[PDB]
Amino acid sequence: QFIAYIAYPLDLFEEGSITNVLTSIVGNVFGFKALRALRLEDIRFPVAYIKTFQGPPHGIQVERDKLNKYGRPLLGCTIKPKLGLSAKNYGRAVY
Amino acid sequence: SYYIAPRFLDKLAVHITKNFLNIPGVRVPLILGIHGRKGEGKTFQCELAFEKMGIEVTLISGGELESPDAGDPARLIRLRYRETAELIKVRGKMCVLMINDLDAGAGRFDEGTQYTVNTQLVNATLMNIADNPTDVQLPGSYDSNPIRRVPIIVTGNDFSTLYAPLIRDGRMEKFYWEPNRDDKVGIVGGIFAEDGLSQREIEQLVDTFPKQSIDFFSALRSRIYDIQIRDFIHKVGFERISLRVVNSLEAPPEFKKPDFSLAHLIESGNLVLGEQQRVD
Amino acid sequence: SYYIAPRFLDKLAVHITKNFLNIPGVRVPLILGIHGRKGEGKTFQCELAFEKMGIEVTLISGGELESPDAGDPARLIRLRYRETAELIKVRGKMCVLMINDLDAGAGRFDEGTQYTVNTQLVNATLMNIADNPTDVQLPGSYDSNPIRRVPIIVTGNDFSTLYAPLIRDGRMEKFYWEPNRDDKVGIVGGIFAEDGLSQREIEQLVDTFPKQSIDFFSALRSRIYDIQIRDFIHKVGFERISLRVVNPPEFKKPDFSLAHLIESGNLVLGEQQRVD
Amino acid sequence: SYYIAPRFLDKLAVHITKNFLNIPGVRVPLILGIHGRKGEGKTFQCELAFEKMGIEVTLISGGELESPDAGDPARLIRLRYRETAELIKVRGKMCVLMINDLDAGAGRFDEGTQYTVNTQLVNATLMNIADNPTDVQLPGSYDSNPIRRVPIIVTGNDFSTLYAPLIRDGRMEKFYWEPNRDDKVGIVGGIFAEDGLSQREIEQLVDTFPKQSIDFFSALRSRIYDIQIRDFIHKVGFERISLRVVNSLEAPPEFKKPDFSLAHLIESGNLVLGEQQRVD
Amino acid sequence: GIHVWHMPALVEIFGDDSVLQFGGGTLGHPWGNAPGATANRVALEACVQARNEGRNLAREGNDVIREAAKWSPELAVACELWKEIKFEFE
């Protein structure tokens, strides 16, 4: 068992597409019959390829400024059960 | 109708048989190598033996993997080995792959005196096959399924020092084939069987040239039409020998079957001896 | 199924392990030298040992240490050493360089023979690797980047005819291999383990032919088997030998009897005496 | 905690310093050549000396001074001299070139051995470097621009088999090494310093084996550790010894200090003499 | 990873309602893409013709490819390059 390092050129992939880069790397290598097992550990993205993506619509900094919440971690809750309740009974639990 | 020496046949039989046989506790050499003088007939005997047995043969030229502008020997030997293994299943008969002039016929002067990059590749490829005969792998489309083991024959003048590991390991067997008086009579007898020579006559030919290659005696038959051609030229005349033969619509030249006598063969033998003597 | 002598395996194992361990304050020899009589199983027992531990071997043949080019045998050693050092780094397991039959290349017998620069150089190279295992240079630009230490195993027939500085306690650990009665019994008992012979019967075979090498017994088995296979080919016939082999009926098992194993061995010695 | 012999340290110290210093009207040899007997510690005491002072070493192997290319070993020395000269300018500390085992490089054993031209050139290259330490020309276009002066240290068993003009007062400082009883006591005492023996006991070890090189005593210590190591291999198991040592997620094994007494050391010492006699 | 010799087995296993795609099989022909396509087409149509008549493609499959190659020069070159293999389907 070993870690293998592989380099790919920039002009091999479509700009602003996670779909294309993911299809290219992990397409037909995991079904190669001469390997028992394979796991992709990590990918390095270059600066030139990052600039083609939008990224997060807002980010951490803007989110806190819109909500006016700082100095503390945010709190959340999931309504139970997963399935069953009516629309009115759902909103009653939410309130 | 060519004669085969019993010893040569025996060495081929045992090697092929033993590899195909499945006896526990027994180790068998995969590769057999034959070294001898040139024009001994090692290649000719191999081809004949296989026909009598009826076993399929795959031939790989020595110059096909020695040439710099040929491809890749490492990729080639592997590909030929797989293809031969397929024959056994489909054909249902024993199949052998053999190589001629592994270190010769390249055009190079050394003849294994100095190694090459290409020389190293064959050693590497062969050693991998000898250790793991059951599984052989190409660059792509790796198959998990095992292949039937295939025997390998190799012929040359001599074997390089690089092969010494294999021989010590006992993975390779080396056979030195040298002709004898009995062998000569058989081979010479077979060549001239169609002509019709007495037993006493055949013995005289071998006795005339006791220390000769097998190739020489075969080459003697060729120089029987020489007298006819030389005499023919005279009737036609030197002025217009070319034009009539080269590009003219006429009856093709006809030659009566040459008379076969011992005297003619001795005279012809002497001329070839003289020429070979002067050249070397 | 093959019996390795416990003395032989322990000498190899302790040599390789100690090279790979970094015990502080101790200087270790990088070369282990095995010498003795011909055909005693110096090479064969190494291959069994390396298979057991599952450790990669880089071989250099003895008939390679003398070429028509000056320095070409010396350049090969450095090239093969650097290749093996990387295999320790990449494969992440123990790798060993084994030079077999060094006596032929770097040796110096009588003064009646004509030697070259290469004899001088092959001795010189092995000295410097043993001094600096971490600093071996490839021809061209110098790099001061350290490499992995690789142990060397060296087989020979005699080391008396070899440059004096290459044989010293600090540079080479010496091992004289002469198989004793107990070794012979084990090894011969390993060859004929499959056939089915009692301990007492194996003892008798060694006693009958005491002045024999390990190869002799293994060569004896092949002779017993070859007669049997030759007869089988004749009985079945050349015309249809392929039909009754691909898909072995009517094949009598080899003799393998103590009484005969003496008889056949005597015939081999008689054949050897004929040449002698 | 290794003992470096005062004579050896003084001789090497003064040679390097005197090159890097500039005294007007004094001409100094570039090469220092140390010779003696095998295993007296020429190479080894140099290495301790270079580490104490903390100075860079460029190493040339003696078995590298002959190649299939003509003038390629001549090119090598000229290249390595420039490389070392650059390290003085950049790093700003003393740097030294060392050719270990010159004897078997540019030397002639007998008057019957066929030599090449490379031997002739290697002698000449060192002659010219020692004459002009400042002007060494890299092949191609000429450039008259000085480089730093670099000292060279040379090891050998015998210098008697070497080109005569290369060994002379003005070109090479000669130094012959042979340790005395006081040196031996000091060095051997340095080896077993952590072990803990009395002065009288150290004397006795030297007395028992008086006709022995330094390497002999160091080789004793290797043999003592065998039992512990053999036990470790069994406990782990022969099947997976490689994994534990080379590539394992565990702390490397610890060995307790074996019993060190004069009686046990002499026992082991006689065992090493017996092994040497076996080959003799 | 399929060539002209895999044709009788693929036709029999996958049936009629299927698509057979040759990546390296068509392009890797010694003469080009156009003879490489014609070799594959002749090999397929000969097996379809033999199936309809009433012949087992396990026993007579190799015989059909050899018979079709007698009149098709494009297939004869393809049979020389790629060697015949034996499928063990029953």
Ligand SMILES: Nc1ncnc2c1ncn2[C@@H]1O[C@H](COP(=O)(O)OP(=O)(O)OP(O)(O)=S)[C@@H](O)[C@H]1O
């Ligand atoms: N331990 C063994 N078990 C079974 N067969 C052995 C064994 N040892 C040796 N043999 C056989 O006898 C031969 C021994 O010769 P080698 O392996 O070449 O070693 P060697 O001949 O002692 O080394 P040289 O020639 O002195 S450098 C082998 O080829 C085997 O066929």
Ligand SMILES: Nc1ncnc2c1ncn2[C@@H]1O[C@H](COP(=O)(O)OP(=O)(O)OP(O)(O)=S)[C@@H](O)[C@H]1O
């Ligand atoms: N000063 C020392 N202190 C401790 N051990 C030493 C000392 N000097 C030498 N040794 C040991 O003895 C060995 C001497 O080896 P070398 O340095 O090669 O001697 P040498 O005279 O250069 O040998 P030749 O002539 O090249 S063979 C070393 O491997 C050390 O283990």
Ligand SMILES: Nc1ncnc2c1ncn2[C@@H]1O[C@H](COP(=O)(O)OP(=O)(O)O)[C@@H](O)[C@H]1O
């Ligand atoms: N048994 C034989 N009967 C007839 N001709 C033979 C025989 N053996 C060899 N030859 C002749 O030898 C020539 C080919 O030699 P070849 O087989 O290549 O020998 P080698 O491989 O030893 O060089 C041909 O002219 C062939 O007729």
Ligand SMILES: [Mg+2]
């Ligand atoms: Mg030294």
